[PDB]
Specification:
By secondary structure, the protein is an alpha+beta fold. Among the domains are: about 150 residues, no CATH class; about 45 residues, no CATH class; about 220 residues, DD-peptidase/beta-lactamase superfamily (Beta-lactamase, 3-Layer(aba) Sandwich); about 80 residues, no CATH class. Helices cover about 40% and strands about 15% of the residues. Helix 15 runs antiparallel to helix 34. The protein is globular. The chain starts with a strand and ends with a helix. Bound molecules: the ligand *C(=O)[C@@H](NC(=O)/C(=N/O)c1nsc(N)n1)[C@@H]1NC(C(=O)O)=C(CC2=CCN([C@@H]3CCNC3)C2=O)CS1 and zinc ion (ZN). Ligand RB6 binds next to strand 24.
Length: about 850
């Protein structure tokens, strides 16, 4: 009884346009039984056919399967296992010296700094943490049980075959012991160059099947020349034949890359998982997006063949329809490619609705994210991340150059350089001035009269720390006489400060409406901003659960009131808590749809072989936000309409056919993006700081030793005070006593963090004038972004659009995408 693999199902748009599909290639297959067949001859024709075959392909310039885990880089023998380990570490700036356990938790500490995982995620069973990494699209090739790398277990087990119980480490030596193993029996009168072409084919065939099975593939795509060449020379090359094997293709390439996902090799760290699930070794599996989400559905139903006699025919995978409109997704992808392009070296944003001039460097931004949802039912109509990818690079499965060289980037700033990262579900950001409608919604529900106005000072002093409108921080801060509508309209932080705190702050604290942070954070929770969006079981979503009330207490003690200055920040978007575009989308959508919390969906329907369908996304929860008076939202949209026509977004929308509600979020630079190596950065610019390098190293090294001496002593003094405890168990004391004899040598960590902390210290001593800014002068700018959130047509809404350009500074950058995606939707 032999398994047949079903044709993989198709992924289509809401209207039936193909996004993921199949296409047939011509493959070379070798039957390991037939080539190793022996009878009267002393030796199998296996080795000769392997050589013949290859030499044929290398003549036709044809790419072949090479998984043989010893390669020669310019006459030097090396393990591929050994190479993949260090390639992984350098992939995300991990120190080579770092072991399996410290290489894993290092990846964790990065993603935790990037907001993808939380601090409570680290204090967590390591398999549940590998699950969280795995769920977000991270696959560290690390077995958490024995704290070792797959490549090592894989090397030991690969050497175990050919009965090499030697374990003596030598790539040059190992190459031989296998070459003349009882199992291979390769003739010695052949050079290790042509003798290695042999092993590629034999070692492959050996690995895939131990129990007799069906053929193995040695070329996945081969041209007309090498087809007819291998049919006519069939009797010469017994075992070698031409089959057809289907492959994954995405005709629109990079379109909806992140929602769609990719198929590729089964991830090394759970091959046993997939083999008990009934998978072959030579098998492609969805590893991201809907491809993985619906792996079981799209994989279809295996049909056996008897052991030719064809018994049970397979059943093709249900066709899965997304909620994405291709037409709109196209505009959304093209939009964001364009803003990043035109923003670099300057240009014009070309728009159906009026092209705009743009000059360079106002952002210096590499990334972008945008989402568009149906506000009634939470169906996602378009979802674009930049950087993105071609799912096709993976169909065949390149796993060295295209994968390594371009699929990650600088690991000390991954949000702006991870093409596999869906910034829309997985990238959290400080919501800027788009939070304001949450603050205003809280104030309204706690009595606020929208028409109440203030003579805007444009700045609030709180002991020579000044919280001011941007219009103040750049001149005289005044929005003159200012009610809620003008506050939302021109984005007055002073108005929001006053309503968020429930008191008139420049002149004491009174107001008479009773509003605090807890009430704002309440209205955060009500708009589902501490909640997963609905996409998490369909695509990669960063979990949105925010720290609990009792979980925040327990880390404080091992107070809980809100400062005025903090409340001020929280009111206007600045805050501990950061949120993803898809999260905001639900929040703005709730304004647009009259106070309903829609659960987002990307998978619409599946359609079986018998052309019947089912609606996957009709379980989705719509839920009446428990507002005191939902008519309060109509004052938000009254505000957000003025933003479009007269406000912060008139540049884009003022001369736009459709009534658009909108709010802009924008934040300026606040520091610098760290390097992958501080220490070397400081060495590279030692001259530029007017400091001798040798001297600075010799001093930094001195300053360290002096901190150690200091730590060492204060250690000795603690052990000795501890030893004066009258009643101390003898084992306890035998430990402390044995430290003082051989130990009392405290050492610093030897990190980039530590060794570079001390070098910067040495620099400032030998240049007593230089500033941190001047030292950090060469680094990229951190802490800037622009949000545009909008919904339309404002007076009877249908669609919400959220757009973010991180490291961007001009709200033009976010507005114009939003404006295209809304324009397109309404059929203009
Ligand atoms: C809302 O987002 C408000 N922003 C801020 O308070 C911040 N200033 O730094 C902030 N919040 S969180 C963080 N890290 N920083 C006000 N609204 C906005 C808006 O809605 O657009 C304005 C900013 C403004 C517009 C144009 N800007 C750049 C300089 C001029 N050309 C580009 C710009 O910063 C006012 S702040
Ligand atoms: Zn103001």
């Amino acid at each position: 009884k032999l398994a047949i693999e079903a044709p993989r199902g198709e992924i289509k748009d809401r209207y039936g346009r193909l996004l993921a599909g199949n296409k047939n290639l011509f493959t070379v297959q070798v039957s390991g039984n037939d080539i190793n067949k022996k009878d009267a001859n002393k030796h199998s024709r296996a080795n000769e056919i392997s050589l013949k075959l290859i030499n044929l392909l290398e003549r036709n310039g044809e790419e072949y399967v090479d998984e043989f885990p010893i390669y020669v880089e310019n006459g030097k023998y090396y393990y591929t296992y050994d190479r993949d380990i260090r390639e992984y570490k350098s992939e995300n700036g991990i120190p080579n010296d770092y072991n399996a356990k410290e290489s894993f938790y290092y990846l964790v500490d990065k993603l935790i700094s990037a907001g993808i995982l939380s601090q409570e995620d680290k204090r967590l069973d390591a398999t549940r943490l590998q699950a969280k990494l795995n769920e977000n699209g991270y696959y560290p090739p690390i077995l958490v049980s024995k704290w070792m790398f797959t490549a090592e277990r894989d090397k030991r087990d690969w050497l175990a075959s050919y009965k090499i119980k030697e374990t003596k480490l030598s790539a040059k030596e190992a190459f031989e012991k296998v070459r003349n193993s009882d199992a291979l029996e390769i003739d010695k009168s052949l050079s290790d160059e042509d003798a290695r072409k042999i092993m590629v084919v034999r070692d492959l065939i050996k690995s895939k099947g131990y129990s007799q099975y069906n053929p193995v593939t040695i070329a996945k795509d081969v041209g007309e020349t090498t087809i007819a060449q291998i049919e006519e020379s069939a009797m010469d090359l017994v075992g070698v034949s031409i089959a057809v094997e289907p492959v994954r293709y995405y005709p629109n390439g990079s379109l909806a890359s992140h929602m769609l996902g990719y198929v590729g090799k089964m991830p090394s760290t759970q091959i046993e998982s997939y083999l008990q699930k009934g998978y072959e070794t030579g098998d492609m599996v969805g590893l991201a997006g809907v491809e993985k989400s619906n792996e079981s559905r799209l994989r279809g139903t295996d049909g056996y063949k008897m052991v030719e006699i064809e018994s049970k025919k397979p059943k093709s995978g249900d066709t899965v329809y997304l909620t994405l409109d291709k037409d709109l997704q196209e505009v959304s992808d093209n939009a964001l490619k364009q803003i990043i392009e035109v923003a670099s070296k300057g240009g014009t944003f070309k728009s159906k609705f009026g092209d705009k001039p743009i000059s360079a460097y106002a952002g210096k931004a590499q990334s972008a994210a945008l989402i568009a949802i149906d506000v009634k039912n939470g169906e996602v109509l378009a979802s674009s991340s930049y950087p993105n990818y071609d799912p096709n690079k993976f169909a065949k499965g390149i796993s060295t150059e295209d994968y390594k060289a371009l699929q990650p980037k600088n690991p000390n700033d991954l949000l702006a350089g991870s093409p596999l990262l869906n910034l829309v579900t997985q990238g959290e950001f400080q919501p800027g001035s788009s939070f304001k409608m949450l603050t205003s919604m809280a104030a309204l529900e706690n009595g606020l009269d929208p028409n109440f106005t203030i003579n805007d000072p444009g700045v609030i002093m709180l002991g020579k720390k000044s919280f001011g409108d941007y219009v103040w921080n750049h001149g005289r801060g005044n929005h003159g006489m200012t009610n809620l509508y003008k506050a939302i309209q021109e984005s007055c932080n002073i108005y929001m400060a006053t309503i968020g705190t429930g008191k008139t702050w420049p002149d004491g604290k009174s107001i008479g409406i009773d509003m605090n942070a807890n009430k704002i954070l309440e209205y955060a929770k009500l708009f589902g901003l501490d909640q997963n969006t609905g996409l998490q079981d369909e695509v990669e979503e960063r979990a949105g659960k925010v720290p609990s009330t009792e979980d925040k207490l327990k880390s404080t003690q091992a107070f809980a009131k809100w400062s005025t200055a903090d409340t001020f920040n929280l009111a206007i978007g600045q805050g501990e808590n950061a949120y993803t575009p898809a999260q905001i989308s639900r929040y703005v959508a709730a304004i647009a749809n009259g106070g309903n919390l829609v659960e987002l969906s990307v998978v619409d329907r599946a359609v079986s072989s018998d052309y019947s369908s089912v609606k996957i996304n009709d379980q989705k929860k719509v839920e009446k936000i428990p507002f005191k008076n939902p008519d309060n939202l109509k004052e938000l949209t009254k505000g957000m309409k003025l933003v479009a026509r007269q406000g912060t977004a008139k540049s884009a929308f003022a001369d736009f056919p459709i009534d658009v509600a909108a709010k802009t979020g924008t934040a300026e630079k606040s520091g610098k993006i760290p390097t992958d190596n501080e220490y070397e950065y400081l060495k590279s610019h030692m001259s530029s700081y007017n400091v001798n390098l040798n001297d600075a190293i010799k001093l930094a090294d001195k300053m360290k030793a002096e901190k150690e001496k200091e730590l060492s002593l204060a250690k000795e003094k603690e052990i000795k005070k501890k030893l004066e405890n009258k009643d101390l168990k003898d084992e306890e004391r035998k430990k402390l006593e044995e430290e003082l004899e051989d130990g009392v040598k405290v050492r610093l960590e030897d990190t980039d963090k530590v060794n570079s902390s001390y070098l910067r210290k040495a620099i400032k001593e030998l240049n007593p004038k230089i500033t941190d800014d001047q030292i950090d002068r060469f680094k990229q700018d951190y802490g800037s972004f622009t949000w545009t959130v909008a919904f339309a047509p404002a007076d009877d809404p249908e669609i919400a659009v959220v757009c973010v350009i991180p490291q961007g500074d001009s709200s033009v950058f976010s507005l114009l995408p939003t404006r295209e995606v809304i324009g397109t939707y309404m059929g203009l």
